Amino acid sequence: PTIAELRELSLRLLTKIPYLKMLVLFGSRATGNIDWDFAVLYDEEKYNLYIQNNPLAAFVIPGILGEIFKINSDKIDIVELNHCSKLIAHFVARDGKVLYEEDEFDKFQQRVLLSNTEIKKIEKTKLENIENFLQRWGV
Amino acid sequence: KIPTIAELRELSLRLLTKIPYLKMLVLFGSRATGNNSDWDFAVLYDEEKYNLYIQNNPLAAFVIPGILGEIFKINSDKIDIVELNHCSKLIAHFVARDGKVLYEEPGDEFDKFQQRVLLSNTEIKKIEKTKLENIENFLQRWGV
Amino acid sequence: NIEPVIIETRLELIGRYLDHLKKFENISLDDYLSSFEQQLITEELLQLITQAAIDINDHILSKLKSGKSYTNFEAFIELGKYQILTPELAKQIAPSSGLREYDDIDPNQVFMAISFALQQYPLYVRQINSYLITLEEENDL
Amino acid sequence: NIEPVIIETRLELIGRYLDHLKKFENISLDDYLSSFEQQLITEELLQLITQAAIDINDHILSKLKSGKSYTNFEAFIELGKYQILTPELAKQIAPSSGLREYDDIDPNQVFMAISFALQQYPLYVRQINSYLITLEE
Numbered sequence: 019p020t021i022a023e024l025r026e027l028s029l030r031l032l033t034k035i036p037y038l039k040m041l042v043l044f045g046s047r048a049t050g051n052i053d054w055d056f057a058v059l060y061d062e063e064k065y066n067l068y069i070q071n072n073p074l075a076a077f078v079i080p081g082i083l084g085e086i087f088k089i090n091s092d093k094i095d096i097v098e099l100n101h102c103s104k105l106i107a108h109f110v111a112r113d114g115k116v117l118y119e120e121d122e123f124d125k126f127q128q129r130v131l132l133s134n135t136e137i138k139k140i141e142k143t144k145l146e147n148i149e150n151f152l153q154r155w156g157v
Numbered sequence: 158k159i160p161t162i163a164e165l166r167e168l169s170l171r172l173l174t175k176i177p178y179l180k181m182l183v184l185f186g187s188r189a190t191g192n193n194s195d196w197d198f199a200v201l202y203d204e205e206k207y208n209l210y211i212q213n214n215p216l217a218a219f220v221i222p223g224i225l226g227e228i229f230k231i232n233s234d235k236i237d238i239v240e241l242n243h244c245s246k247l248i249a250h251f252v253a254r255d256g257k258v259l260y261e262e263p264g265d266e267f268d269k270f271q272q273r274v275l276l277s278n279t280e281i282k283k284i285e286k287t288k289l290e291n292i293e294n295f296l297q298r299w300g301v
Numbered sequence: 302n303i304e305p306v307i308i309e310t311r312l313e314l315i316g317r318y319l320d321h322l323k324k325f326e327n328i329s330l331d332d333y334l335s336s337f338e339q340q341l342i343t344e345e346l347l348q349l350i351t352q353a354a355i356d357i358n359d360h361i362l363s364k365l366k367s368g369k370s371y372t373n374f375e376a377f378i379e380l381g382k383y384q385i386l387t388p389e390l391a392k393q394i395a396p397s398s399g400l401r402e403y404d405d406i407d408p409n410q411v412f413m414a415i416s417f418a419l420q421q422y423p424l425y426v427r428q429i430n431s432y433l434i435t436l437e438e439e440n441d442l
Numbered sequence: 443n444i445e446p447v448i449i450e451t452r453l454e455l456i457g458r459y460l461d462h463l464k465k466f467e468n469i470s471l472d473d474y475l476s477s478f479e480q481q482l483i484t485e486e487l488l489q490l491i492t493q494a495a496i497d498i499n500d501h502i503l504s505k506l507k508s509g510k511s512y513t514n515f516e517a518f519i520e521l522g523k524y525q526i527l528t529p530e531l532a533k534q535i536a537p538s539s540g541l542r543e544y545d546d547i548d549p550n551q552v553f554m555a556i557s558f559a560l561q562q563y564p565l566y567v568r569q570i571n572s573y574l575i576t577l578e579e
């Protein structure tokens with residue numbers, strides 16, 4: 019399905035996912051070089067009421083998208099933007115394409131994007147953990 | 158593309174190059190019965206050849222599904238492998254009863270396999286009783 | 302027809318996995334979060350349990366509605382329509398099918414799934430066991 | 443056009459998984475067969491490690507040979523053709539890609555894979571780490 023096609027079917031997602039505030043397609047399918055990566059942002063208030071008559075509603079999310087988008091539910095990855103790492107949020111904002119919102123994606127972009135100075139600071143931190151591993155293991 | 162059993166039988170001849178120690182390959186499960194799921198394959202290895210091969214390649218069992226997926230042109234992620242050399246009597250029973258043979262060397266290896274692992278209904282019902290006794294014991298212990 | 306030995310093997314495994322899973326029944330969220338190995342064990346058990354139940358559902362539906370394709374979720378619901386499971390249990394347990402590239406597995410959500418499974422899957426064993434006993438009587442008359 | 447932070451995150455996870463997996467370095471085969479939980483931990487760690495490596499390989503080959511389709515096995519081999527991995531290590535470790543309705547898992551073969559991973563994947567960490575340092579220049 020095309021990005022435009024995915025957006026048209028997404029209007030019907032409010033019925034099956036009522037607490038949904040925004041859905042973003044990121045990853046390889048968004049980057050222009052064709053699994054499917056999907057990021058969701060929830061209404062924290064509405065989600066807590068629903069999580070009471072359905073304790074595992076997060077585990078049903080991939081099936082709901084697969085049935086509507088007609089994509090293999092086994093190859094669908096879901097990132098919950100309400101509680102994910104800054105690094106994952108950054109890449110969702112930078113390359114992702116918005117599929118449903120209720121000026122909400124731009125607010126999300128401005129709130130989680132990272133500068134190159136912040137990214138190079140993170141990547142330097144990770145290289146330190148990798149080098150300590152290599153040192154501790156004598157390889 | 159879903160290949161026919163005849164097509165699988167032609168493609169299986171190419172397994173000797175990638176799996177030299179392969180003695181028998183059996184398609185069992187739903188794909189043998191007739192009923193969009195996974196593919197079940199049972200393999201019989203030459204234990205002598207397998208030990209020589211496992212020396213130079215310690216994880217050769219883990220490449221088998223990838224080898225079949227490339228040759229049968231089926232999704233490697235939906236390929237299940239049962240190693241008949243270390244499987245339960247019950248699984249061996251169902252491989253023999255409904256399975257369809259795809260490769261054997263020699264040609265009387267599946268029939269000899271059937272006679273050696275098939276179970277009578279009296280043996281099968283004895284297993285069903287032991288499992289039902291464990292299931293009812295579980296239910297009693299959990300108070301449901 | 303339906304082959305009881307296939308279902309009874311998965312039911313026996315579900316009970317075995319559940320007996321293992323109960324060893325964490327009284328573990329605190331703090332103790333659960335501080336042990337990655339325990340998180341690996343519990344996440345692994347819930348996967349084995351759900352897979353066994355999925356296999357049971359698919360075998361049963363292979364004979365009642367032969368040829369029809371069901372997703373893991375609707376398979377549970379369809380067992381409630383055939384009264385093999387109570388519709389309450391089918392609706393309460395069908396999201397469990399979601400338990401089977403990105404490390405999106407939240408330990409806080411899995412910790413909830415432990416108590417979920419310890420409450421719903423024993424009932425799944427009971428109701429499926431009764432369906433088998435139902436099968437033994439119809440096979441006689 | 444290659445993202446070091448993406449590779450470094452997966453590499454850092456591999457190191458964490460391996461530090462956990464090292465707790466099984468001196469375990470006996472008999473003790474391993476008598477513990478279902480240790481088999482679950484071990485089976486889960488090996489899956490997490492290889493999956494990260496496959497993700498790293500997929501990201502790297504995404505930039506060099508963009509558009510070409512590679513299986514998980516051939517990806518390891520292709521990293522040897524570009525000298526990112528030593529051809530020796532690429533050949534020795536590519537069968538790891540196989541670690542990623544019937545419960546036909548043999549504990550004896552997984553037990554062998556513990557020692558395999560503890561010897562080959564640090565080399566993978568070292569070799570990929572050197573590729574990253576090359577990218578800085």
Ligand SMILES: *P(=O)(O)OC[C@@H]1CC[C@H](n2cnc3c(N)ncnc32)O1
Pocket residue numbers: 045046103105106109403404447448451
């Ligand atoms: P994606 O397009 O492949 O990029 C991944 C992005 C950069 C690193 C970060 N990331 C990946 N995997 C992570 C885990 N397991 N934890 C935190 N951050 C992660 O997202």
Ligand SMILES: *P(=O)(O)OC[C@@H]1CC[C@H](n2cnc3c(N)ncnc32)O1
Pocket residue numbers: 186245247248251306307310544545546
């Ligand atoms: P298949 O037709 O779905 O299974 C064949 C037969 C039914 C029970 C038995 N079986 C399946 N899976 C088993 C495990 N994990 N252990 C013992 N027996 C098993 O095979």
